[PDB]
Symmetry: D2
Subunit: 232 residues, 4 copies
């Protein structure tokens, strides 16, 4: 299967597959069952920002999600990603809906990777284009004329569809670690707008790092967030 | 045919096709016959650096090539690249040899492109830096004779196991991702590129040179573009 | 007297001292009488963005000012700033009012300077960004009437507690550290600057404008430089 | 007194004031007695590189020192620097000699600080100037025409002086934390050349963060590294 490291913004508690009983942010290391989670108050219709940070020295993957009123949730997990990820990867954003739904709109996304022994890759999207040639769109993900990336399906009356899954990966492979590097670090930021009129929103948005040839696993809508073939 | 904007470091004067009679740097807009050149002293076996700069406000494409002893050459050309380039491009490095030959070794390469707009840090950007190349450089598209090695360099043209450059060689490296080089709503579109290189020859004369280029995304080496055509153009027109 | 290079966003036409008869952006080299101007439509109460670009290879100082509806003005001037500026400078923002007045509110300001040389990433650089200013902005030198506030903005000229701008006001903000704007061994010296601004007036006419400037490190507001002199120059010469 | 957070490259073991018995890198939080150390093989006459990394999310101050042959030492310490440092600071490099000596030559220094809620400061010195107007030199520190920063005294026959102490601080104050920031991060890199013909080199080099008005404490040569008035 694919190899997956992901930071999940989990809006729907599936407390039978390891979720806590409450919306959360979690650090996923090769399993949808987060190694680490923190309670997250999602603010319906508000623009949130997620920051993800890691370096090979501290060996701590950290993430924080916040809203303009200052409320925020943070989670960190100690892990040496040299022993998890392949040397070359692709980086992306993933989202899904299931029986409940939400918009999974990305307003911006930036990523930086550095190997210092410097080699580096940095991209910033503050506005997306209709035909975004440096993005690989998988599943239901589209870019529009409003400058945003819709990861899951939306009807032309701006209503989110259910049972939807979509991804956006940066076109170029990324050299995420190299043995001779004294420092391998990466950081990513994205802003998002999750809006729902359901009685509960679902299922969430994730930033993920995968094998270069990663594709949406069969049957990964809903609680699997377009990342994992199963809940193991 | 491809669309090509390029900065050439031209080591061999082909005066029959518009070259000045002396090694030179030039700005190539859709033709190997540079719109603008400057005399260039290539220092055999020394590591040189080339810097390339452009922005949509000044609409002046500039380049300077320098060596550690301080000598440098510069060329600038006024051009609105919105009227030349496709909206999406690939960026790359190209080099060739012909009847004369040289190593066309790249030791490092960086590139930045930015689109800035109406408010600020409504910004799209792409930046990459290679200060060491790896054997399997997955974010580079190698064409023709170009290879990357475990010595950390990019050899654009063929070299023998004994380090000797070969003639009638052509090769290029393109960054893997397409680049959004202009966009109509942006107020500023800028790019900049730097590479360092080691051109060394024992021939009666070095040839043919190295170029930084920007092309349509599906650009490939034109057939027969060794020698004076630098792997960029199908003819000397 | 100070040495001043500036990009002016000039809201009030002082045709008696060389202004065109219409609001404009201009490039000021040691004089308030711009070497180059372009007609500029200031949009009262809208947030505008100014971008300023220069590098030592093209030796073209460029600037563009734009608003959210898409309208923009641009000006460029060919000049070798090595022959104008001291090796070390301070960079800043300046604004003034006179018989007419306007808010001269800065919402954000960024600046990058780079010296690149013989090999590569033998690079010296300075980069700062303010997207929010604080009450006690310790890395800014405020002169004249300039203040920073808890609304996150920099008010270059005086405003009343009821939000109303005042006349006969002048103020500036300089980044605290000196900047090494050129160095003889560098092959490339570049700088770039961006700021966003909100100019709003209820007067019969707004005046006088905002400038991005580069000065000697010990530059101070010239006496009597309110109004048409924009806090930059001691006279209209 | 001053407030000091520092990463020390400690070439001389003062095992009576807390040093381990062997050259080390350590994380100093308001005391020369490092909260955390790691054994460090200093390579006489070789150019080393030090990287220092921190962010307010993971709350882990990390540092790594390496040489071109790949040998390296790393240390990390969990600390929330919002509770240690004043909001505004100056950042600098410090070095000293005592009864034993070494050159304390800085070949380059870069620093980046960001507040994301972005405000940012970044400077890079890959070559120093004779009159470096954006550096505050304290004590014996000088910049030369060879492009380097000599933190401690050197005779005109390139021999390092003893009982020497000097510092270089960046001219502008740095806004190192702000309450509303979702992410406050900083990173610093410097390259250095420590060379000695003594029978033991001493005393070391540190990257430090201080109150804006920090100055060399009286009697901080030797084992105090120009940072602390005493060994408490
Ligand atoms: O542009 C990026 O993606 C990096 C900066 C993140 C960012 C840019 N603008 C913001 C407004 C609110 C919260 C976060 C941000
Ligand atoms: O230039 C800086 O200070 C940041 C990069 C650090 C760095 C630049 N060149 C190197 C060679 C060896 C080891 C580290 C480096
Ligand atoms: Ca869930
Ligand atoms: Ca030729
Ligand atoms: Ca005027
Ligand atoms: Ca010691
Ligand atoms: Cl399952
Ligand atoms: Cl031909
Ligand atoms: Cl006058
Ligand atoms: Cl003591
Ligand atoms: Mn979950
Ligand atoms: Mn030519
Ligand atoms: Mn004017
Ligand atoms: Mn110690």
């Amino acid at each position: 299967a694919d190899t997956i490291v992901a930071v999940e913004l989990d809006t729907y508690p599936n407390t039978d597959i390891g979720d806590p009983s409450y919306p959360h942010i979690g650090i996923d290391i090769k399993s949808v069952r987060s190694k680490k989670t923190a309670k997250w108050n999602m603010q319906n219709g508000k623009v949130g920002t997620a920051h993800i940070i890691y370096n090979s020295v501290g060996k701590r993957l950290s993430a924080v999600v916040s809203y303009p009123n200052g409320d925020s949730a943070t989670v960190s997990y100690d892990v040496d990603l040299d022993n998890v990820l392949p040397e070359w990867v692709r980086v992306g954003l993933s989202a899904s809906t299931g029986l409940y739904k939400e918009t999974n709109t990305i307003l911006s996304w930036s990523f930086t990777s550095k190997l210092k022994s410097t080699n580096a890759l940095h991209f910033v999207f503050n506005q997306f284009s209709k035909d975004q040639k440096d993005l690989i769109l998988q599943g239901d993900a589209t870019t529009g004329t409003d400058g945003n990336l819709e990861l899951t399906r939306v009807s032309s009356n701006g209503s989110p569809q259910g049972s939807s899954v979509g991804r956006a990966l940066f076109y170029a492979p990324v050299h995420i670690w190299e043995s001779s590097a004294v420092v391998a670090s990466f950081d990513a930021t994205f802003t998002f707008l999750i809006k729902s009129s359901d009685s509960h929103p679902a299922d969430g948005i994730a930033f993920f790092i995968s094998n270069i040839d990663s594709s949406i696993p069969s049957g990964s809508t809903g609680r699997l967030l377009g990342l994992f073939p199963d809940a193991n």
